[PDB]
Write a protein that binds this DNA or RNA. Structure first.
Ligand SMILES: [Mg+2]
Ligand SMILES: [Mg+2]
Ligand SMILES: [Mg+2]
Ligand SMILES: [Mg+2]
Ligand SMILES: [Mg+2]
Ligand SMILES: [Mg+2]
Ligand SMILES: [Mg+2]
Ligand SMILES: [Mg+2]
Ligand SMILES: [Mg+2]
Ligand SMILES: [Mg+2]
Ligand SMILES: [Mg+2]
Ligand SMILES: [Mg+2]
Ligand SMILES: [Mg+2]
Ligand SMILES: [Mg+2]
Ligand SMILES: [Mg+2]
Ligand SMILES: [Mg+2]
Ligand SMILES: [Mg+2]
Ligand SMILES: [Mg+2]
Ligand SMILES: [Mg+2]
Ligand SMILES: [Mg+2]
Ligand SMILES: [Mg+2]
Ligand SMILES: [Mg+2]
Ligand SMILES: [Mg+2]
Ligand SMILES: [Mg+2]
Ligand SMILES: [Mg+2]
Ligand SMILES: [Mg+2]
Ligand SMILES: [Mg+2]
Ligand SMILES: [Mg+2]
Ligand SMILES: [Mg+2]
Ligand SMILES: [Mg+2]
Ligand SMILES: [Mg+2]
Ligand SMILES: [Mg+2]
Ligand SMILES: [Mg+2]
Ligand SMILES: [Mg+2]
Ligand SMILES: [Mg+2]
Ligand SMILES: [Mg+2]
Ligand SMILES: [Mg+2]
Ligand SMILES: [Mg+2]
Ligand SMILES: [Mg+2]
Ligand SMILES: [Mg+2]
Ligand SMILES: [Mg+2]
Ligand SMILES: [Mg+2]
Lengths: 159, 169, 58, 294, 121, 213
RNA sequence: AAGCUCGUAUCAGUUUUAUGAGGUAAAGCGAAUGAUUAGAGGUUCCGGGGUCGAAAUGACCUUGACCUAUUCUCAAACUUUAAAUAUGUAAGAAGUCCUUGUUACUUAAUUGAACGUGGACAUUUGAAUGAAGAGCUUUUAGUGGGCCAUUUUUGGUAAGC
RNA sequence: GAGAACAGAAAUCUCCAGUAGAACAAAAGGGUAAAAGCCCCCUUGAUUUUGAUUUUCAGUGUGAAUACAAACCAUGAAAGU
RNA sequence: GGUUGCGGCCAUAUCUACCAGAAAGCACCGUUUCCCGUCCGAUCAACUGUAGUUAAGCUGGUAAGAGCCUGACCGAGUAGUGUAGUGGGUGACCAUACGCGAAACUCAGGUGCUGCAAUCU
């Protein structure tokens, strides 16, 4: 018979990192989680309790609840033709603050700051991110750089 | 150089490998008691061996650890029996040494036919001061190279006092 | 007689006719499975913070 | 020692945490002291850290940050001279003493030192410091033994009794105090009281001097040099609490020389390490010494 | 750019010229007004729809394209996709569904796009 | 027994070596892989010639053997038991299978027993290597050439720019030896690094840092 | 199919930016595990068969095992490393900030925690591109033998299997 | 590995090296070292009440599991568990 | 800058060998009446800081040192790979177009950083 236990196919997913087995460092237990925090889910197979099912490995979601030893996390999950709402009880050992949100908050703090120093000058801001643009015209010089000119190479076995 | 590190007998452990359980083994222990002044400890068989006739977790052998001036005294009594000569064997690379005697009455000790006659092993282990470094709970550590006991060293020790002979090689 | 056993062929086509959407979204979302004591106290912090506002109308 | 470590071994060898190697931190037990009920967020767990060296007694109150442990206040036995304890600087009575000083001192600086008196009476009885209804709650602190054995009658539980009686809330139980008879499963507060005042020490002095004029005169050389009579010991400790609860405040030491001053001498005994340039110069000479078959 | 890439076997593109743009917008310019594809035959229509961003003429439309610039987005979106014919003259190659570098059509043919468009225009 | 090579010439299946899950395979038909003067010093045979696969297939053990013999023999009669070193540079690690039909069973339960071994061999991948003295180039090429006829697919024959089985262009090899950076050993040879511990680096290769010449 | 609530919105089989997850391809084996060719030096003072005084608790021997540094070659159910393609999340009014309200939760603590009052901030208000409108309910037909191609891929010698 | 009367390949007694090459009922995989392994001490959280959740899923059942709430307990100096 | 206590990241920190270490600290160390634990006051417990010593631990320095880290137009734009073709080829397989792109290898640099509190020529 086929075999579809709970931790199937997770031989390498829940392995520890090479030369990173053993006690989980204290940092992990000192990070504080509030509701509305966006957490990254990544199981640690030494902490067997509060484990995320293998689906949620690699998935980010928001804390809806905070408890003695675990956060509750909301995950949107597609089944069939629609996302369903999913509530996960994960111990903190399997959870991490999502850096991408910190890029965002820090940018929001930037964009309020930029906006001030412009009304304090009544000038214009230009606050939206622009994407990487073409390139403007340049004049490269030949001073100390007369173009070495290359040509294709003969065939030659080295074995 | 040579101040601290004066090199001494850490402990002496006498063994009688009786090899069977019951009266013979209670009797062998009593000897070790009647000698060490200590209450000795029984050893259990690590595994069943049929040609020797021992079963797993059977009480087979008894030993007692002696330290301090007593063990220095029971060492001599033995040394006395081996006529103050040992072999360049006996001395382990790590600095400890040992020997064995047949017949325990040969070092003091009345006879007492309700106790009979046992022989016994004599392993004495050597250290210096500063060995608690390897033994304590907190900040356990390893001795330094230019410290710590060896066989060259604790053979010459053995000759210097005891006025002894170590034989062969 | 033997027949085909399984396939996901055509299934994402089917799922994507009028499907995927997103998940439905609300401020004041469900409080399903939140710490019961906290809810209990939240209950009270609300009644109070209500009250106090009607007191500020006379 | 020709048990050489195969380069394989070394390569996939995984070092313990630094302070594990040092045999200082029990990380299994740390994780449980430090960890907060996540729904108390940045409510710091506070630790009563009590360590003994061979000549001193350390008492810190610590909380944990990701970037490091932080101390609210620290007290020592080597402060105790200022408060009248000159000898026996690592015995039980100095442990209680040091446990008291830290108590008074922290929760002085905290502000709850007028409220939460403590005991003042001290018959060494078992009791925690319950909070005053219609008021604050006491500064709660959890003992941190570290690596010390839990033996009944241990020095480290002196500092505990010192701190509890100081009016810190420090959860505990009797059965590791001197006085705890395990047949009885009861505590004889006379023994515990005695210990606070160095009873077990004083007695021995009396037994010694009578029985051994010579040993005593050696073991207790400095009680002689200062005429500390033995049965005056209690009054040293009793008086010392007085002055402790009196002025619990911390005063530093008067330090000759400034930080830089020390430094610029205090390890220009440091061995300065070569530059790769010189190093190569050493390499190329060493050979000529060794080159030529021998 | 990463879009173009994704789509490169199915399209043929390059760098247009005032000429090609001028004639594309004149001859085949239709605006988007409440869906409806409306032909730009009088300047009023652009100004009624693109005036808010400046642009009250057809050459105002053109300029805002060739220069890209600020309301290109809304200018260009206004412009209904151009319905070109098939190339009068031919594709100039045996098979079109290789790359321009390989012997014809599909991919960036750069400032060759003009000769192409003009024959499809 | 033994169905044609044609039934197993292509790398159609993930490698299936003998393993704790595949115990009970028979023994490879080729067992010897080094022969000729296999103990000869690195200096003796400076010339190296290779029999190179130009396809991507599988070579049976039995091919390897058959070709090995046909190589060794022709080499020895024409220049002798000690005039070359022949190294079979490819091992038959992979197991072929037979389903094996004995009314009849059918395509049900078609998983096969082990049938024999082969070597999954690549484009460019060396098959045979030979080392000799330069004055045996042509006798060597024909050893290999005679062997080609025993192997499925186009396999090329190439003159190595290498001093024997070592690496290093022949010129770069002679720099090193006449510098004393090279020390003999079990038929192969060790090299002097500028990496390890100085002491036992000079006790291993005295000749390098020395008066001498 | 019936519509209903609305009306540019929140949308998307897409890119970008930022930040996650992964152990396949490749790679590797003088790195672990498991395989595998070859010598070389050293061991036994603790397996051995002899010759030298039957001598041997003694020598030099070939021979195993073991050790050291090399060497040729491998893995769906080995691996340090480790892609490409795919894949999670985020890119703001349900936001940001300041003031200080509630509570029985929590704190040594008007400390926190949640939810608020009041005040301030709308040109690009927080990337791209598109939008043929978005949202939503009810109900019912058929169907529930499939097959083919490129690519990935399992069994089989293979197959229009 | 080096050492100790009878003691032998194998009894029991030291010391040194030792990242796990061991052990953890069982298949295999993951996980673990002042432990999750070995020895000891105290124990009945293998308990009481009904909810929420994760997997398989129709997001039905069943199994198994996870995190709280409200009791009553066990253990420990304690945090805790 | 030393040193200690509690730490963070957990080898640039570990391994091997040799030296060096002012001052303070830490340590080894002295003792066994007392609470307490041992076959053994060795560990554990208590006591003195008194009799001693930097020998060891610990701290640094050395080493064409083992390991580990960092880099590099070092190998290699290679291997692998997304997309394309009525491309080559009997096939096995390969070249080209638009893209992404490693491992080993080689060489080069490096060998703990750091928070809180205390203390020191
Ligand atoms: Mg299966
Ligand atoms: Mg897999
Ligand atoms: Mg470990
Ligand atoms: Mg469980
Ligand atoms: Mg017997
Ligand atoms: Mg049927
Ligand atoms: Mg069929
Ligand atoms: Mg069907
Ligand atoms: Mg079926
Ligand atoms: Mg190496
Ligand atoms: Mg503990
Ligand atoms: Mg008693
Ligand atoms: Mg036309
Ligand atoms: Mg014409
Ligand atoms: Mg025509
Ligand atoms: Mg043309
Ligand atoms: Mg036939
Ligand atoms: Mg197949
Ligand atoms: Mg079957
Ligand atoms: Mg079968
Ligand atoms: Mg592969
Ligand atoms: Mg690799
Ligand atoms: Mg291997
Ligand atoms: Mg397979
Ligand atoms: Mg997507
Ligand atoms: Mg848009
Ligand atoms: Mg229907
Ligand atoms: Mg239906
Ligand atoms: Mg139906
Ligand atoms: Mg067992
Ligand atoms: Mg298992
Ligand atoms: Mg056991
Ligand atoms: Mg049950
Ligand atoms: Mg004792
Ligand atoms: Mg002692
Ligand atoms: Mg002690
Ligand atoms: Mg030490
Ligand atoms: Mg190195
Ligand atoms: Mg096509
Ligand atoms: Mg083709
Ligand atoms: Mg054809
Ligand atoms: Mg290719």
């Amino acid at each position: 018979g086929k075999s579809h236990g709970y931790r199937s196919r997770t031989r390498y997913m829940f392995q520890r990192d090479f030369r990173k087995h053993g006690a989980v460092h204290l940092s992990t237990y000192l990070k504080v989680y509030k509701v509305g925090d966006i957490v990254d889910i990544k199981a640690n197979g030494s902490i067997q309790k509060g484990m995320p099912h293998k689906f949620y490995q690699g998935k980010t979601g928001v804390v809806y609840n905070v408890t003695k030893s675990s956060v509750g996390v909301i995950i949107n999950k597609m089944v069939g033709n629609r996302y369903l709402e999913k509530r996960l009880n994960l111990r903190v050992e399997h959870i991490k603050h999502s850096k991408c949100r910190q890029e965002f908050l820090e940018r929001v703090k930037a964009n309020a700051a930029k906006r001030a120093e412009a009304k304090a000058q009544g000038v214009a801001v230009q606050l939206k991110r622009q994407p990487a643009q073409p390139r403007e015209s340049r004049i490269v010089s030949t001073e100390g750089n007369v173009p070495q000119t290359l040509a294709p190479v003969p065939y030659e076995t080295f074995i | 150089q040579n101040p601290m590190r004066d090199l001494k007998i850490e402990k002496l452990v006498l063994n009688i490998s009786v090899g069977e359980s019951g009266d013979r083994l209670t009797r062998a222990s009593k000897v070790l008691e009647q000698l060490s002044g200590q209450t000795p400890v029984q050893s259990k068989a690590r595994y069943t061996v049929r040609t020797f006739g021992i079963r797993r977790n059977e009480k087979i052998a008894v030993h007692v650890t002696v330290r301090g001036p007593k063990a220095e005294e029971i060492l001599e009594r033995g040394l006395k029996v081996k006529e103050y000569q040992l072999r360049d064997r006996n001395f382990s690379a790590t600095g400890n040494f040992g020997f064995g005697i047949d017949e325990h009455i040969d070092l003091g000790i009345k006879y007492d036919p309700s106790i009979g006659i046992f022989g016994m092993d004599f392993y004495v282990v050597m250290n210096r001061p500063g060995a608690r470094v390897t033994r304590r709970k907190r900040c356990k550590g390893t001795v330094g190279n230019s410290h710590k006991t060896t066989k060259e060293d604790t053979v010459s020790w053995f000759k210097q006092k005891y006025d002894a002979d170590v034989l062969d090689k | 007689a033997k027949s085909k056993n399984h396939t996901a062929h055509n299934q994402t086509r089917k799922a994507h006719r009028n499907g995927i959407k997103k998940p439905k979204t609300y401020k004041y979302p469900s409080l399903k499975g939140v710490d019961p004591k906290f809810r209990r106290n939240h209950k009270h912090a609300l009644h109070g913070t209500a009250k106090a506002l009607a007191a500020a109308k006379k | 020692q020709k048990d050489a470590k195969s380069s394989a071994y070394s390569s996939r060898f995984q070092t313990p945490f630094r302070r594990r190697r040092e045999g200082k931190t029990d990380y299994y037990q740390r994780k449980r002291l430090v960890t907060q009920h996540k729904a108390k967020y940045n409510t710091p767990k506070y630790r009563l850290v009590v360590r003994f060296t061979n000549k001193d007694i350390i008492c810190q109150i610590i909380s944990s940050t990701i970037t490091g442990d932080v101390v609210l206040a620290a007290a020592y036995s080597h402060e105790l001279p200022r408060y009248g304890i000159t000898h026996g600087l690592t015995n039980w009575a100095a442990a209680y003493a040091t446990g008291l000083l830290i108590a008074r001192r922290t929760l002085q600086k905290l502000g709850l030192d007028e409220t939460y008196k403590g005991v003042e009476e001290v018959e060494g009885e078992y009791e925690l410091t319950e909070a005053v209804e219609d008021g604050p709650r006491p500064f709660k602190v959890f003992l941190d033994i570290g690596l010390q054995r839990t033996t009944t009658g241990a020095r480290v539980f002196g500092a505990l009794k010192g701190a509890s009686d100081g009016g810190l809330y420090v959860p505990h139980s009797e059965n590791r105090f001197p006085g705890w008879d395990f047949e009885t499963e009861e505590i004889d507060p006379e023994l515990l009281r005695s210990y606070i005042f160095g009873g077990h020490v004083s007695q021995y002095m009396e037994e010694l001097a009578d029985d051994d004029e010579e040993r005593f005169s050696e073991l207790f050389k400095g009680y002689l040099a200062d005429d500390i009579d033995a049965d005056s010991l209690e009054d040293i400790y009793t008086s010392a609490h007085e002055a402790i609860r009196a002025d619990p405040a911390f005063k530093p030491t008067e330090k000759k020389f400034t930080k830089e001053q020390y430094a610029a001498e205090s390890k220009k005994y440091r061995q300065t390490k070569l530059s790769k340039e010189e190093r190569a110069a050493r390499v190329a000479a060493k050979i000529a010494a060794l080159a030529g078959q021998q | 750019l990463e879009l173009l890439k994704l789509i490169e076997p199915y399209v043929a593109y390059g760098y247009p010229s005032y000429s090609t743009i001028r004639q594309l917008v004149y001859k085949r310019g239709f605006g988007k007004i409440n869906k409806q594809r409306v032909p730009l035959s009088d300047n009023a229509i652009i100004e009624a729809n693109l005036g808010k961003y400046g642009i009250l003429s057809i050459d105002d439309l053109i300029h805002e394209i060739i220069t890209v610039g600020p309301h290109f987005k809304q200018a260009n979106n206004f412009l209904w996709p151009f319905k070109l014919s098939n190339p009068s003259g031919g594709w100039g190659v045996p098979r079109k569904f290789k790359h321009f570098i390989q012997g014809g059509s599909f991919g960036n043919r750069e400032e060759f796009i003009n000769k192409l468009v003009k024959s499809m225009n | 027994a033994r169905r044609p090579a044609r039934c197993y010439r292509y790398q159609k299946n993930k490698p299936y070596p003998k393993s704790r899950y595949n115990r009970a395979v028979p023994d490879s038909k080729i067992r010897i892989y080094d022969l000729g003067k296999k103990k000869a010093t690195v200096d003796e045979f400076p010339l190296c010639v290779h029999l190179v696969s130009n396809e991507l297939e599988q070579l049976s053990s039995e091919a390897l053997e058959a070709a090995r013999i046909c190589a060794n023999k022709y080499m020895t009669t024409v220049s002798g038991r000690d005039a070359f070193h022949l190294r079979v540079r490819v091992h038959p690690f992979h197991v072929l299978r037979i389903n094996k039909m004995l009314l009849q069973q059918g395509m049900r339960g078609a998983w096969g027993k082990p049938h024999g071994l082969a070597a999954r061999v690549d484009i460019g991948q060396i098959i045979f290597s030979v080392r000799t003295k330069d004055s045996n180039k042509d006798v060597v090429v024909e050893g290999l050439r005679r062997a080609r006829y025993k192997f499925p697919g186009q396999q090329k024959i190439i003159l190595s720019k290498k001093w024997g089985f070592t690496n290093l262009d022949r010129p770069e090899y002679l720099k090193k030896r006449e510098a004393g950076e090279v020390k003999d050993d079990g038929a192969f040879v060790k090299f002097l690094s500028k990496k390890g511990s100085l002491e036992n680096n000079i006790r291993e290769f005295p000749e390098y840092f020395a008066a001498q010449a």
